[PDB]
Amino acid sequence: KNIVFIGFMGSGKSTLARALAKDLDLVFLDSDFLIEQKFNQKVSEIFEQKRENFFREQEQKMADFFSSCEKACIATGGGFVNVSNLEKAGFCIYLKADFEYLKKRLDKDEISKRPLFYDEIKAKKLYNERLSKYEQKANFILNIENKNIDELLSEIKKVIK
């Protein structure tokens, strides 16, 4: 029984999962951080060297891991939604916002994943391809626009009861 946060870059998944973990006194896991720790390399470096498929295989390894662990609050990378058995990882919360809202911000934990000023054209295309997956795999969809962390935690806590 874990709480899993999914969504695109800029959606504040790590920040929110960490706050909920501290608030509920649960373990905070971040798939990207666990991959970085395992290889002693930043996500950007892993992608730059081993390429796409290798990273996705490692995300699937984390998804398998999340499918059997318990009592965790888990943050996942933008492309994690593509793993094969995401529903087994726990109650999935999709942190949702429009592309224009997400593109103007970044979370501190995302600095190591890609360039600060990523290609917007390519990112929008990727965003549009992933919406259906985020929507379909979510157990709860939470629009995050113009909401502070306290507001988000309150909504989630309410949904959890």
Next chain:
Amino acid sequence: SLAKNIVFIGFMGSGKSTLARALAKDLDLVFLDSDFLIEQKFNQKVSEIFEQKRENFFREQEQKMADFFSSCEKACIATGGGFVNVSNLEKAGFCIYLKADFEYLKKRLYDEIKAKKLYNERLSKYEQKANFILNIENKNIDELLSEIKKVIKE
């Protein structure tokens, strides 16, 4: 019963994080580090958590980590020096004690008098909770990995 994980225990400086990480990469397993997980949850370094919240709070957090490790599988886990103080450590997995003399560890990484006293007090715990005692002195990473893989039959 034991969770199907490998858990490295021992004093600070015994190379638990390094060896757990190398074994995880070698066997393509998940690498967990109790100190790093506690640091991530609080967005603070272990030293800061100890300074502000004090020892008991930190040990409580190590206990939550031990409980979590007992629930998961196929992980290679590094633990802090004081993690042996948790209850039900055996449930976290197959425990490997990275053993070395205090005088050997001190040449790797404050108050040596107090440190040796703490080292002496923990030895019996490391030894009693170990499923496998691995003497790390004078061994490089490849040698330690080979020795562990023979033990777990990889």
